[PDB]
Amino acid sequence: ADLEDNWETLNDNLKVIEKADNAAQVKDALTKMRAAALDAQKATPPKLEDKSPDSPEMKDFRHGFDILVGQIDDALKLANEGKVKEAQAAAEQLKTTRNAYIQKYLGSGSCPSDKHLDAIPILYYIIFVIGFLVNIVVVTLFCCQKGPKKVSSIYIFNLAVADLLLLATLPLWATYYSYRYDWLFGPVMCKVFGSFLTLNMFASIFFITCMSVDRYQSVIYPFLSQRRNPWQASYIVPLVWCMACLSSLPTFYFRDVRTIEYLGVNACIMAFPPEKYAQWSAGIALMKNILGFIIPLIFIATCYFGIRKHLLKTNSYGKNRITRDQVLKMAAAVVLAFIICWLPFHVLTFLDALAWMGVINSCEVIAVIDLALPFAILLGFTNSCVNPFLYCFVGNRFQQKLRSVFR
Ligand SMILES: COc1ccc2c(c1OCc1ccccc1)C[C@@H](C(=O)O)N(C(=O)C(c1ccccc1)c1ccccc1)C2
Ligand SMILES: CCCCCCCC/C=C\CCCCCCCC(=O)OC[C@H](O)CO
Ligand SMILES: CCCCCCCC/C=C\CCCCCCCC(=O)OC[C@H](O)CO
Ligand SMILES: CCCCCCCC/C=C\CCCCCCCC(=O)O
């Protein structure tokens, strides 16, 4: 007897019609749908409870269900005439109006691309070249290297390739933003380069974790080169890319171009099943926090504080303090650079999830989330500019200062 419940009754009876053999089954399902549509018509949308009954938005709201009942009656006519297949075809027209509802009222849409800043496209390209240069230096340095590479370098290389490949998609999103969320590259490049981003970004976050584990292993076990298993890197590297691949599978199944009518543009969005669009957006958002921040941060944090106590356990010399503090400074940078770059995006992601769940119905809050999302998304890309400084460039100084305190 609620708007959310009235739409579940409708989309559930839509399925009954699609799998039916006689017109009596269709007639029965359509009868329930007509009652739900009329009842839903008497349900103010929760996100705009403030708006008065006669506001033009509540006029278009109740009107959407008049179009719906009109289609439900046209199908009932065919079903009463024993035209089961004709009625089923008419029910396809209902999914078209149901799609119009979830865009207009369900989610962020009820509160436009006309919040466009010229800065974002400028900033996105700035990070692109800056990141592509520092990361093309990381890989090229390996050519000029003069020493024995530890398994750590394997993670440095894979971290840079992922950073380069995800940074390589920044021009797509800068142009996508400059054209007010109107995808021009085609429907295949939205599903492809949309998942390709999520793929390399999970890989980037998963390899950052491998680095924090390896460095924690380096402090607790000084003889780690011999202590290692030669095959471990041969197993860990494939495993990371596969975990990143599995983590981005939802993007590949759903990421596709869909036409936003009221905006008149072709957007590259997550095309969830409309009958469960809110539940997926909330669920997928929460898996972004867990797999992409919570679980990762549990490793970096544990590895850091595990390094911190070990260094505090060895000695207390006044000079060795300098060598041990520089290691703590370098271990404290990866953990801080990760939360500074990623905590903004994931907080907004969690809040957006609380919106799809119905907790945050404030439009002023949802507007702030939408206005701050492109900047938070940029800090995520920025950690790809900070990774070269955190590992590669300070990689020679890390190994040396452990061999000093382990003399
Ligand atoms: C056609 O668009 C887009 C398709 C797919 C994606 C995005 C996108 O939006 C991009 C966009 C930017 C600017 C303007 C318009 C769009 C952005 C982002 C997201 O969930 O929302 N995303 C990501 O994998 C995340 C992410 C989060 C957790 C763990 C791994 C990856 C991401 C966040 C921040 C920085 C990089 C990656 C895929
Ligand atoms: C933008 C800045 C806002 C800051 C918000 C950060 C959000 C992440 C929260 C915690 C991650 C770190 C976990 C901290 C847990 C402390 C563990 C600890 O203190 O361990 C002591 C050690 O064991 C001695 O014996
Ligand atoms: C290896 C371990 C990996 C762990 C894997 C992480 C996956 C995410 C886990 C839990 C989130 C569950 C979210 C599902 C619930 C979605 C919200 C919902 O259904 O409710 C919507 C709302 O009620 C309508 O108004
Ligand atoms: C970045 C900050 C992250 C905050 C931690 C939140 C972690 C959430 C983890 C699992 C979500 C649990 C289930 C989600 C709510 C149940 C669905 C519902 O209530 O309808």
UniProtKB/Swiss-Prot annotation:
Disulfide bonds join 111-363, 190-268. It comes from the Eukaryota. Changing residue 345 to H: Does not affect angiotensin II-binding. The chain crosses the membrane at residues 119-143, 154-177, 188-213, 233-254, 280-305, 331-354, 368-393. Residues 178-187, 255-279, 355-367 are extracellular. Keywords: Cell membrane, Disulfide bond, G-protein coupled receptor, Glycoprotein, Membrane, Receptor, Transducer, Transmembrane, Transmembrane helix. Belongs to the G-protein coupled receptor 1 family. Receptor for angiotensin II, a vasoconstricting peptide. Signals primarily via a non-canonical G-protein- and beta-arrestin independent pathways. Cooperates with MTUS1 to inhibit ERK2 activation and cell proliferation. This is Type-2 angiotensin II receptor. The chain holds residues 35 to 334 of 363 of the full protein.
